[PDB]
Amino acid sequence: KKISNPIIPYVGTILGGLVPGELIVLHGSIPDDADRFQVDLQCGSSIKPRADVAFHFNPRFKWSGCVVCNTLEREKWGWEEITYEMPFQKGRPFEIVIMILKDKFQVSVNKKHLLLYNHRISLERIDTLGIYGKVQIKSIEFVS
Numbered sequence: 614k615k616i617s618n619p620i621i622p623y624v625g626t627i628l629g630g631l632v633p634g635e636l637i638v639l640h641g642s643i644p645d646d647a648d649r650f651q652v653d654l655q656c657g658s659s660i661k662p663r664a665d666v667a668f669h670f671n672p673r674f675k676w677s678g679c680v681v682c683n684t685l686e687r688e689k690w691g692w693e694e695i696t697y698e699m700p701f702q703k704g705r706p707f708e709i710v711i712m713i714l715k716d717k718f719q720v721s722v723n724k725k726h727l728l729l730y731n732h733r734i735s736l737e738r739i740d741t742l743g744i745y746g747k748v749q750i751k752s753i754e755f756v757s
């Protein structure tokens with residue numbers, strides 16, 4: 614389903630899960646005082662024990678800024694993949710597009726390539742989208 618101005622923190626089921634070729638399109642904005650936010654593609658929404666996170670996409674505004682990606686499995690974070698770019702800007706709107714491929718997620722921000730991330734958890738296990746932190750979201754759309 615298309616989601617408009619969701620409640621942040623957002624935790625919602627992804628109807629039909631994800632398949633290769635599909636896009637997750639997020640329109641949102643960053644508050645003036647943001648420190649970080651994250652978009653998590655999860656297996657369920659359990660809090661204790663904490664739901665596995667197949668893909669954690671985590672922009673951090675400190676210093677020059679970076680984006681940390683990782684996977685949480687059995688309540689433990691794996692090895693981080695850090696992209697030392699920061700396309701997000703405080704006080705500004707953004708578009709994130711996550712392209713789902715057989716081997717990787719490919720992420721663009723504001724129609725510019727940002728990063729690739731190899732799957733660590735099988736794609737079919739993802740059933741939940743989580744968005745947390747200092748971020749506002751105008752819309753979430755899943756494109757077939």
Ligand SMILES: CC(=O)N[C@H]1[C@H]([C@H](O)[C@H](O)CO)O[C@@](O[C@H]2[C@@H](O)[C@@H](CO)O[C@@H](O[C@H]3[C@H](O)[C@@H](O)[C@@H](O)O[C@@H]3CO)[C@@H]2O)(C(=O)O)C[C@@H]1O
Nearest residue numbers: 651653669671681682683684685690691692693694745746
């Ligand atoms: C209640 C709360 O604050 N939850 C946040 C958690 C916890 O603080 C954390 O799990 C410890 O209890 O962390 C979230 O942020 C983590 C996540 O971005 C992962 C991704 O790899 O990195 C963690 O920080 C790393 C850091 O990047 C490393 O350099 C190293 O120093 O270790 C730390 C800790 O592992 C983040 O804490 C989370 O989702 O787990 C955000 C939560 O709001």
